[PDB]
């Protein structure tokens, strides 16, 4: 909780380099919630997802690799539940990236 | 182009920038009107006076 | 773990989401860019044709001892058949108006037609240049004639030569067709011999098959129109009487060919097309041998063959397009491509068109798809155009010439013939594009290592192509800055658009270290050839910099000489004046570092000691003691006014003042006797 | 095609760009791992020269300067920065840092060396910046605010000899270099830009034919060709070539080259202008050639 104010993606690369998949699932769970205004500032982020701000970013390369790194052990129900815990949360995120994109386009066409 | 004052368009532009109604773009220009101001400030004239100075010279 | 791959795109959480602009890892988090380099190289960040590939577009799999001769031989032929003009800042290369080039190429491809692995392409080029020989080249039948040969005798022998070419371009397919047909149908085998004009072999196979009246009919056909008109009646009789439908269609096809009928309409309503299933050459050869008199021109045989494949309002197509020699035999019935409104043909057909129709399209003629199975091989395309430009054809577009010259110059850059890419770009009539294209390409390819290969290309470009050598060394200077060699940058800036760049580099990068090493004679080598008034009057800041370093060296040299020879007072007056001219100019050097402050201060210290030795040679002793001249006898009155201007460190100035007090005490002690 | 090298670029994360120097001796590569990595690649080797970390976001493009100015590289980032880097005595440090943008800077491109050492940069706020080296360390900066609506995505300079634009000049005067560039954006526009007699920058012409956001745009190098040509690509999957057949008409023709199954990301001209490379959304490159019949043919599929 010092490195989160510097790079949560370089931390997520380290957690994948070291097989810390559950810490990676909850780091991604905290990062997606940071961009959504549940403490953006703890992740260094100046502004949460808004049609009044700079555009946001997430390490999808590392998230696709985390979903694979879980799914490579598909005989375990815990790896399946940890994968769903990412996927279901990325739609409460991406439905708002879609709305914030529509809210922004309706503020660059007036 | 100038027909009543030396550097008339830059003089007019400064007299216009003094007015609190100036909702114009601030092109970098000289802020002084002695003939050394472009070389002392290292700032340009506006290009009508900057054509007349090049024509004249 | 191990690191995983980039997850394939149809399994990415980003899939399809490129429009979600508020998240940059959706909007661009799966994008990539790619960078070109010289020689047709590409830096690829995706899938091949984390990591990056370096990939090259290249024609075929490298036999450099063979491949290069198919570029270099045509190029050392074309460089005999253009003139080089030198009346602009960049020279221009222009074709020699004439015919000779067609023989330079035709006999070169006759020699090249043997063991070489490009044999299909080289043989198609042989057909193209022996066709140019048969249309616009020259002879074995009119050089025997000790008088100027009449236009019709020329036209007759051009037709007699082309009436060999259309058999030679047909035999190997006839000889396979006969090998297959002979034992199943001798009628198709006899027809195949006749479509190559092999009438002796057709008569022979008809005597061998038991068809001796076909052999009789065919032997009488080598001239007589009476047998053509008697067969014209006999076909009209068999049709009207409905007896045609008891004769073989393959035999009726021979009777139609002999009767000079390209299509025959039977009483069944069947049509026999005589050109059906054939190639483009045998289709045209039927027009040249069976559908026209012996006296007609090539241009009428070709126009009757175009009248056989174009969409008229009144007749169906019966002749075929059948293509460059890499699409023949393929079975490709081109199903009329619903974009491509110009159907592909052979370069040999397009040249026959241009001979028959002086305003026919040059774009379909020069496109590589008409010549080879490769859209990157402009070898024949450019050498055809730079023969047609010599034959006074001028209706190509400047975009199409620009695309041809730039594509062939790029093909010559890509396989490393960059000196010949310059030869192609020197045929650009537009001077402002020509200088730019040559200076740009030189700036890529000129090396700092003057290798035997660089030296051979540089001597080729300067001594054949007249390329201004200033740009070879401008390019070497732009290379020397990138590889940080400031000696080769100074020395290549010196050979080029020069004066100021080399000087202001020397004064910041070479002058001080050369003085510190006492390497005066090296720094002199740059400065004395910068010094001439035709050059130094064009150099900024010269008299306070380069002239000060140089007058310092020449003052040292003129003392190195006076320390070896019985020189005159006139030369020592000059030396004292040159030293006095130098003190209040070392005073004026621009110094950027402690190296320059060291060079300036030891130049100053050396000058303070030079001034003493010069003045003790102006103040030698009386002729009563055979002693050497004392530098500590010099009057203070001639030293102090000039030393009181020298930029010298506090320890150098302190020991100068100790020397000056030593001579002052002698001006006193010799004043009291 | 044929492979010379398969560089193991030590990037841990997605690579957004890969560019060589003017001579094809070095390779620069940028990424989501907050780095630009520089290599020697001569004769098919690989040697890492530098790991240029010091952008703070994902880096979206790199551009080498012309060697007439020495060993200079530029790069642009998600963090709003454009950083200029230089090799002197063989070590790399930062030689400028521009943060004067209001969102992510998605593209950078250098001018022809004949215009002076000038950089152009395009931003997600909608603006473009120009940066001119004034001397011995200093830079001028011009910002063309609102240059595209919704956002700016790509920038590419016009080459310093426009065809035909020399005929009126009597022998012994200089060429008047009419500085221009093209740019693409999320307004579906390509726009052409010019410097005026006041040193200000102006929207000269529009190029309107894509139905969806323009991703990228590149000007063809004026070598041999008497025409002025541009390529550009879109989020609908199109590629258009654009010709200008008379430089005095200033008039342009849109010629559709292809329409792919997904997005097209980038367009890249050969160093002899005769060939175009095209980055597909399915991880691919495709390669394209103008015929003597003026038709655009693929050479990769």
Swiss-Prot record, chain A:
Transmembrane segments: none annotated. It is found in: Nucleus, Nuclear pore complex. It comes from the Eukaryota. Functions as a component of the nuclear pore complex (NPC). Involved in poly(A)+ RNA transport. Part of the nuclear pore complex (NPC). Forms part of the NUP160 subcomplex in the nuclear pore which is composed of NUP160, NUP133, NUP107 and NUP96. This complex plays a role in RNA export and in tethering NUP98 and NUP153 to the nucleus. It is linked to Nephrotic syndrome 19: A form of nephrotic syndrome, a renal disease clinically characterized by severe proteinuria, resulting in complications such as hypoalbuminemia, hyperlipidemia and edema. Kidney biopsies show non-specific histologic changes such as focal segmental glomerulosclerosis and diffuse mesangial proliferation. Some affected individuals have an inherited steroid-resistant form that progresses to end-stage renal failure. NPHS19 is an autosomal recessive, steroid-resistant form with onset in the first or second decade of life, resulting in chronic kidney disease. This is Nuclear pore complex protein Nup160. The lineage of its organism: Eukaryota, Metazoa, Chordata, Craniata, Vertebrata. The gene is NUP160. The chain holds residues 1327 to 1436 of 1436 of the full protein.
UniProtKB/Swiss-Prot annotation, chain B:
Signal peptide: none annotated. It comes from the Eukaryota. Disulfide bonds: none annotated. Ubiquitously expressed in fetal and adult tissues. It is found in: Nucleus membrane; Nucleus, Nuclear pore complex; Chromosome, Centromere, Kinetochore. Part of the nuclear pore complex (NPC). Forms part of the Nup160 subcomplex in the nuclear pore which is composed of NUP160, NUP133, NUP107 and Nup96; this complex plays a role in RNA export and in tethering Nup98 and NUP153 to the nucleus. Does not interact with TPR. Interacts with ZNF106. It is linked to Nephrotic syndrome 11: A form of nephrotic syndrome, a renal disease clinically characterized by severe proteinuria, resulting in complications such as hypoalbuminemia, hyperlipidemia and edema. Kidney biopsies show non-specific histologic changes such as focal segmental glomerulosclerosis and diffuse mesangial proliferation. Some affected individuals have an inherited steroid-resistant form and progress to end-stage renal failure. NPHS11 is an autosomal recessive, steroid-resistant and progressive form with onset in the first decade of life. Plays a role in the nuclear pore complex (NPC) assembly and/or maintenance. Required for the assembly of peripheral proteins into the NPC. May anchor NUP62 to the NPC. Involved in nephrogenesis. Belongs to the nucleoporin Nup84/Nup107 family. It comes from Homo sapiens.
Swiss-Prot record, chain C:
Changing residue 525 to V: In a breast cancer sample; somatic mutation. The modification Phosphoserine is found at residue 185. The modification Phosphothreonine is found at residue 628. Disulfide bonds: none annotated. This is Nuclear pore complex protein Nup96. The gene is NUP98. The chain holds residues 1112 to 1817 of 1817 of the full protein.
Curated annotation (Swiss-Prot), chain D:
The keyword Coiled coil does not apply. The GATOR2 complex is negatively regulated by the upstream amino acid sensors CASTOR1 and SESN2, which sequester the GATOR2 complex in absence of amino acids. In the presence of abundant amino acids, GATOR2 is released from CASTOR1 and SESN2 and activated. PROSITE patterns: WD_REPEATS_2, WD_REPEATS_REGION. The modification Phosphoserine is found at residue 183. Keywords: Acetylation, Cytoplasmic vesicle, Endoplasmic reticulum, ER-Golgi transport, Lysosome, Membrane, mRNA transport, Nuclear pore complex, Nucleus, Phosphoprotein, Protein transport, Repeat, Translocation, Transport, WD repeat. Pfam families: WD40. GO terms for molecular function: identical protein binding; structural molecule activity. It is a peripheral membrane protein. Belongs to the WD repeat SEC13 family. Functions as a component of the nuclear pore complex (NPC) and the COPII coat. At the endoplasmic reticulum, SEC13 is involved in the biogenesis of COPII-coated vesicles. Required for the exit of adipsin (CFD/ADN), an adipocyte-secreted protein from the endoplasmic reticulum. This is Protein SEC13 homolog. It comes from Homo sapiens (Human).
């Amino acid at each position: 909780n010092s490195y989160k104010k510097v790079d949560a993606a370089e931390l997520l690369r380290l957690y994948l380099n070291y097989d810390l998949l559950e810490e990676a699932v909850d780091l991604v769970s905290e990062y997606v919630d940071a961009v959504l205004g549940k403490g953006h500032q703890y992740f260094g982020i100046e502004f949460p997802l808004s049609a009044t701000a700079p555009m946001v970013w997430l390490p999808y390369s590392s998230i696709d690799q985390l979903l694979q790194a879980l799914g490579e052990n598909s005989a375990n129900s815990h790896n399946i539940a940890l994968s769903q815990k990412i996927l279901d949360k990325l739609e409460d995120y991406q439905q708002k990236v879609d709305k914030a994109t529509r809210d922004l386009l309706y503020r660059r066409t007036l | 182009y100038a027909k009543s004052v030396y550097w008339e368009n830059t003089l007019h532009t400064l007299k216009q920038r003094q007015l609190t109604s100036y909702v114009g773009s601030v092109r970098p220009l000289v802020t002084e009107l002695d003939p050394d101001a472009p070389i002392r400030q290292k700032m340009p004239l506006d290009d009508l006076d900057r054509e007349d100075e090049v024509r004249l010279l | 773990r191990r690191q995983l791959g980039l997850v394939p795109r149809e399994k990415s959480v980003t899939y399809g989401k490129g429009k979600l602009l508020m998240d940059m890892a959706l909007f661009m988090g799966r994008s990539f860019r790619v960078g070109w380099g010289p020689n047709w190289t590409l830096a690829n960040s995706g899938e091949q044709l984390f990591k990056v590939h370096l990939e090259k577009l290249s024609l075929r799999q490298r036999k450099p001892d063979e491949d290069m001769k198919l570029y270099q031989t045509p190029l050392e032929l074309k460089l005999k058949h253009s003139t080089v003009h030198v009346d602009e800042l960049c020279p221009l290369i222009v074709p020699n108006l004439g015919v000779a080039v067609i023989h330079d190429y035709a006999d070169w491809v006759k020699e090249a037609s043997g063991d070489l692995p490009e044999a299909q392409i080289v043989k198609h080029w042989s057909l193209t240049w022996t066709l140019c020989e048969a249309l616009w080249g020259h002879l074995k039948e009119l050089d025997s004639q000790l008088n100027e040969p009449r236009e019709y005798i020329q036209i007759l022998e051009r037709r007699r030569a082309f009436s060999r070419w259309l058999s030679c371009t047909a035999t190997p397919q006839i000889e396979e067709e006969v090998s297959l047909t002979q034992k199943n149908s001798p009628v198709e085998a006899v027809f195949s011999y006749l479509t190559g004009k092999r009438i002796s072999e057709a008569c022979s196979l008809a005597q061998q098959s038991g068809d001796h009246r076909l052999a009789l009919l065919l032997s009488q056909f080598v001239g007589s129109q009476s047998v053509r008109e008697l067969l014209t009646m006999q076909l009209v009789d068999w049709h009207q009487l409905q007896a045609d439908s008891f004769i073989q269609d393959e035999r009726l096809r021979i009777f139609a060919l002999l009767a000079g009928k390209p299509v025959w309409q039977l009483s069944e309503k069947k049509q026999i097309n005589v050109c059906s299933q054939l190639d483009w050459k045998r289709s045209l050869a039927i027009h040249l041998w069976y559908l026209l008199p012996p006296t007609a021109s090539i241009s009428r045989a070709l126009s009757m063959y175009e009248e056989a494949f174009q969409n008229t309002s009144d007749s169906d197509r019966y002749a075929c397009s059948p293509l460059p020699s890499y699409l023949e035999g393929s079975g490709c019935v081109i199903a009329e491509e619903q974009n491509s409104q110009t159907p592909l043909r052979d370069v040999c057909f397009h040249l026959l068109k241009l001979y028959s129709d002086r305003h026919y399209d040059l774009n379909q003629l020069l496109e590589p798809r008409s010549i080879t199975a490769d859209p990157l091989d402009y070898r024949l395309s450019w050498h055809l155009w730079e023969v047609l430009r010599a034959l006074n054809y001028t209706h190509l577009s400047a975009q199409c010439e620009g695309v041809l010259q730039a594509s062939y110059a790029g093909q010559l850059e890509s396989e490393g013939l960059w000196e010949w890419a310059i030869f192609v770009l020197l045929h650009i009539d537009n001077s402002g594009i020509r200088e730019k294209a040559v200076r740009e390409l030189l700036t890529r390819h000129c090396q700092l290592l003057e290798t035997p290969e660089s030296w051979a290309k540089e001597t080729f470009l300067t001594q054949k192509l007249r390329v201004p050598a200033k740009w070879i060394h401008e390019a070497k200077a732009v290379r020397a800055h990138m590889e940080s060699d400031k000696h080769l940058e100074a020395l290549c800036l010196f050979k080029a658009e020069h004066w100021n760049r080399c000087h202001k580099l020397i004064i910041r990068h070479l002058a001080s270290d050369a003085i510190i090493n006492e390497n005066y004679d090296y720094l002199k080598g740059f400065l004395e050839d910068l010094a001439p008034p035709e050059r130094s009057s064009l150099i900024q800041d010269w008299e306070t910099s380069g002239l000060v370093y140089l007058d310092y060296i020449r003052v040292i040299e003129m003392l190195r000489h006076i320390q070896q020879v019985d020189c005159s007072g006139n030369d020592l007056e000059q030396l004292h004046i040159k030293v006095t001219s130098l003190c209040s100019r070392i005073e004026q050097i621009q110094c950027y570092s402690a190296k320059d402050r060291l060079a300036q201060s030891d130049m100053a210290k050396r000058v303070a000691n030079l001034l003493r030795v010069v003045l003790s040679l102006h103040h030698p002793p009386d002729r009563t003691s055979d002693s050497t001249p004392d530098p500590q006898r010099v009057p203070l009155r001639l030293l102090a006014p000039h030393i009181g201007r020298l930029p010298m460190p506090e320890d150098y100035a302190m020991d100068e003042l100790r020397s000056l007090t030593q001579s002052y005490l002698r001006e006193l002690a010799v004043g009291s006797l | 095609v044929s492979v010379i090298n398969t560089v193991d670029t030590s990037h841990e994360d997605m690579i957004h760009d890969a560019q060589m120097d003017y001579y094809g001796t070095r390779l620069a590569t940028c990424s989501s791992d907050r780095s630009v990595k520089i290599f020697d690649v001569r004769n098919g080797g690989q040697i890492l020269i530098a790991d240029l970390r010091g952008h703070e976001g994902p880096v979206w493009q790199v551009a080498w300067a012309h060697p007439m100015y020495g060993n200079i590289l530029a790069s642009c980032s998600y963090d709003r920065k454009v950083i200029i880097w230089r090799e002197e005595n063989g070590t790399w440090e930062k030689s400028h840092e521009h943060a004067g943008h209001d969102s992510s800077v998605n593209s950078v491109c250098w001018a022809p060396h004949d215009y002076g050492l000038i950089l152009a940069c395009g931003s997600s706020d909608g603006a473009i910046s120009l940066l001119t080296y004034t001397g011995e360390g200093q830079w001028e900066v011009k910002k063309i605010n609102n240059a595209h609506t919704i956002g700016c995505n790509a920038v590419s300079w016009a080459p310093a000899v426009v065809p035909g634009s020399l005929i009126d000049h009597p022998s012994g005067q200089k060429p008047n270099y009419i500085k221009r560039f093209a740019s693409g954006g999320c307004d579906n526009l390509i726009k052409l830009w010019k410097e005026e007699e006041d040193g200000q920058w102006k929207e000269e012409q529009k190029l309107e034919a894509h139905s969806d956001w323009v991703r990228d745009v590149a000007w063809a190098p004026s070598i041999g060709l008497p025409t002025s040509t541009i390529a550009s690509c879109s989020q609908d999957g199109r590629v258009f070539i654009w010709t200008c057949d008379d430089a005095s008409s200033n008039t342009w023709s849109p010629k559709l080259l292809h329409k792919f199954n997904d997005v097209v990301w980038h367009v890249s001209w050969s160093i002899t202008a005769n060939i175009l490379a095209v980055s597909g959304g399915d991880n691919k490159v495709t390669l394209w050639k103008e015929s003597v019949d003026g038709q655009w043919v693929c050479i990769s599929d």
